[PDB]
Amino acid sequence: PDQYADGEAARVWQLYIGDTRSRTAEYKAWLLGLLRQHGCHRVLDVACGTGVDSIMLVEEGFSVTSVDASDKMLKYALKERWNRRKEPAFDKWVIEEANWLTLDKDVPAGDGFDAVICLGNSFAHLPDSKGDQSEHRLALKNIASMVRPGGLLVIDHKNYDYILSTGCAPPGKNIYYKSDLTKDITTSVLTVNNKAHMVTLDYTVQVPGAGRDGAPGFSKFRLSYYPHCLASFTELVQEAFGGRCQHSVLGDFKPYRPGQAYVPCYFIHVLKKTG
Ligand X SMILES: C[S@@+](CC[C@H](N)C(=O)[O-])C[C@H]1O[C@@H](n2cnc3c(N)ncnc32)[C@H](O)[C@@H]1O
Torsion angle of alpha carbons 160, 197, 102, 12, nearest 10°? -60
Out of 100, 113, 203, 266, the residue judged to bind ligand X by CB under 6 A: 100
- Exposed, middle or buried, 32 (CB in 10 Å: 0-12/13-18/19+)? middle
Question: By rule CB under 8 A, what string of x and - marks binding of each residue 148-187 to a second copy?
Answer: ------------------xxx-----------------xx
Q: Is the dihedral of CA 166, 265, 117, 3 positive or negative?
A: positive
Question: By rule CB under 8 A, what string of x and - marks binding of each residue 53-92 to a second copy?
Answer: ------------------xx--x--x--xx--x-----x-
* 266 is an interface residue for ligand X by CB under 6 A: no
Phi, psi of 229 (to 5 degrees): -90, 145
Q: How many residues bind a second copy (CB under 8 A)?
A: 24
Strand duo 113-118 + 245-250: pairing = unpaired
Question: By rule CB under 8 A, what string of x and - marks binding of each residue 184-223 to a second copy?
Answer: --xxxxxxxxxx-x--------------------------
* 182 is an interface residue for ligand X by CB under 6 A: no
* 94 is an interface residue for ligand X by CB under 6 A: no
* 65 is an interface residue for ligand X by CB under 6 A: no
Q: Cβ of residue 149: shortest distance to a second copy, in angstroms?
A: 32
Cα 263 to Cα 162: distance, rounded to the nearest angstrom: 8
